């Protein structure tokens, strides 16, 4: 939330002090999470290694 | 035997006969604390041009004492003492002599010959690697890494 | 530590034996004020030729005091003191000795060594970029910007 | 706070121990007025060789006073004071020691450093402009101007 | 302000301490008359080599007087005064000091700098004008005039 550069806003209002938040889940639950993403979310690459003499 | 601070100051005072063990007239301790402060400042300055020689600066906020351990090697004693004497003689309205200057220069050269490095120049990074080195096509070994 | 403005003047006065414990002479208050003013003027002047060294000036009505902080690191103390001594000796009509001059110039050389930056030249701006840089997909630069 | 025409004449006459705060003998005020006049004439002749540095001249015909502010920055007072002392040393039949000369030279070099010009000469005026600059569509002219372009002043 | 002729002679005498408040010596009127006459003659001689610099000469077959107006800007005051002092020192059987000579040299150098010419010689007169100048449709001259 930029007031000098409003071009890059990505949220309705600023997160002021004293705002109420919450955490999704349970105290000590464990699970296997499902995943959904886009093609350009994260990238993976393998660096080739050099030969030795 | 550790080379504590103030021993260098005593050596510098002795080598110009300002004060020593055999002197009937001695110098007040204010001069000694001024000398140790001058030594501290001189080492702080030496942290730039000659380099780092393992000097143990006082930590926290307490002032340097004339009895704490300096941590310097024994081999640097004459060099440090002569430099301190050169930077300190003018305090007593005195002028140096040619033999003292020659001794200081020789000791400084002996100290400086230890810190010599002579860096080596690596490859440009665009220099081709000879095909006889048997590089790998896809591992970007055809050229030198250069730096970083 | 803090390295107040009062400490620097006292160091210069102690050197050359104008006011020191060894000389059995105490410092007059007026000489301290003159030294502080000269230090202020010198450090204001040093903002152009040697460069900025982080010295802190007073605000509004200056009235610099010996108990005010200076902001200088402990390394530059000897250089600043020797320069102040050279610029202040004319007050008492005293000709400096060669050893003091050598010490001052050596400390000043170390100080200028510490803050030395060597600019690096850049390409003209109409200089071509070769085909080896792949200016089709890797970069859009047919020529170096080279000006900034 | 600000530089005044009086404290420069006090930096002088004290850098050479002629008079000072701690001195038991002080100089007569007529000498201080003469020093102020000498300073004004010096900064008047400095309008040509070193160029303007920001001096605030006594506008009008009124006589200058040592209590006026000169407007000079605090980083210019040392060179001005040393040059003025070099000028007025001969008034009291004195000679300058070499250290004073060296300090004055260093301060003068420092002052002269801050006012560099480097005119950076321009082109000729009939020098051709290459086809690479696209003088057909991009810029109408096909030769180097040799003068400042404008929008309506048009020389 | 106005810079009357009496200002120059008093300045010249004061700068070598012939008669000044610092020296406690009062000025002799005969010295004033001699200084005024010497200044007038020196300006009349300066009307050739350094060129006119705005002097206001005395007319009407009347001798110059100190209360008259010189007509010069204040910038030339130091140079004129130093030159006049140099030309009057031999009257009192004195010898100039090197600092006075250096100051006079610097002032005269500034004066000479202020009055440069660099005439920037013209063309020859039979030098052709190129055919690109269009010496008939746009110009009436086929050759550079190079005169007057």
């Amino acid at each position: 939330y930029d007031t000098t550069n409003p071009q890059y806003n990505s949220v309705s209002r600023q997160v002021e002090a004293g705002d109420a938040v919450s955490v999704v889940g349970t105290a000590s639950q464990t699970m296997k999470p499902n995943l959904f993403y886009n093609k350009f979310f994260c990238g993976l690459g393998s660096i080739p290694l050099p030969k030795l003499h | 035997t550790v080379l504590t601070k103030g021993e260098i100051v005593l050596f510098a005072l002795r080598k110009f006969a300002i004060a020593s063990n055999a002197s009937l007239t001695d110098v007040e301790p204010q001069s000694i604390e001024d000398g140790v402060n001058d030594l501290e400042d001189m080492m702080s300055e030496w942290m730039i041009n000659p380099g780092d020689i393992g000097y143990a600066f006082a930590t926290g906020d307490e002032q340097p004492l004339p009895d704490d351990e300096s941590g310097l090697p024994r081999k640097y004693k004459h060099a440090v003492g002569y430099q301190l004497l050169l930077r300190m003689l003018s305090d007593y309205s005195l002028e140096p002599t040619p033999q003292v200057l020659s001794n200081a220069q020789r000791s400084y050269d002996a100290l400086m010959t230890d810190t010599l490095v002579v860096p080596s120049m690596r490859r440009r990074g665009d220099f081709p690697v000879g095909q006889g080195n048997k590089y790998d096509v896809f591992t970007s070994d055809r050229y030198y890494p250069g730096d970083l």
Side-chain angles (χ1 to χ4, degrees), chain A, chain B:
Chain A
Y1 200 87
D2 206 345
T3 189
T4 305
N5 293 114
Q7 294 82 17
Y8 294 106
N9 280 299
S10 81
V11 75
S12 70
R13 72 191 273 279
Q14 201 164 22
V15 184
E16 321 206 0
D19 291 337
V21 311
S22 74
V23 186
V24 194
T26 306
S28 295
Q29 184 178 2
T30 184
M31 81 293 284
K32 190 178 291 294
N34 308 288
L35 275 159
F36 86 102
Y37 48 86
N38 193 48
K39 186 67 160 293
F40 294 94
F41 172 44
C42 295
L44 172 65
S46 178
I47 302 300
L49 272 186
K51 194 142 61 183
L52 295 164
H53 267 283
Chain B
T1 312
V2 291
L3 193 55
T4 187
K5 310 192 205 177
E7 181 36 60
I8 313 164
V9 184
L10 284 196
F11 164 86
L13 281 166
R14 182 215 310 160
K15 295 302 291 293
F16 204 99
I18 290 145
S20 67
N21 264 297
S23 193
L24 305 171
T25 314
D26 274 306
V27 65
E28 289 293 298
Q30 182 70 23
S31 300
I32 313 297
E33 66 89 20
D34 267 347
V36 308
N37 274 14
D38 288 25
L39 168 65
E40 191 46 14
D41 307 331
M42 172 165 97
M43 289 313 146
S44 190
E45 181 186 50
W46 271 25
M47 272 286 128
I48 300 167
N49 187 15
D52 169 63
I53 58 174
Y55 187 60
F57 298 87
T59 187
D61 285 336
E62 71 295 340
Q63 278 82 349
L65 276 297
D67 292 312
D68 46 21
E69 191 216 9
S70 164
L72 279 163
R74 186 60 71 104
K75 59 188 75 57
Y76 299 155
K77 172 164 186 242
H78 277 172
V80 176
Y82 279 121
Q83 297 306 323
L84 196 147
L85 180 60
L86 277 177
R87 295 188 106 89
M88 172 175 117
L89 281 174
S90 68
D91 192 17
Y92 295 83
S93 71
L94 292 176
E95 297 163 15
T97 49
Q99 189 53 38
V100 176
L101 298 156
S102 166
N103 290 130
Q105 188 274 331
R106 296 271 318 279
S107 300
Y108 198 61
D109 180 90
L111 158 67
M112 189 148 286
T113 191
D114 267 344
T115 74
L116 187 59
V117 297
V118 194
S120 88
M121 303 209 306
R122 306 204 42 203
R123 299 287 177 186
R124 187 168 171 79
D126 312 334
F127 207 94
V129 160
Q131 196 171 356
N133 283 165
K134 283 183 229 273
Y135 49 68
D136 199 357
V137 181
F138 300 123
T139 72
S140 76
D141 291 331
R142 282 97 69 80
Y143 290 89
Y144 277 88
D147 280 326
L148 213 51

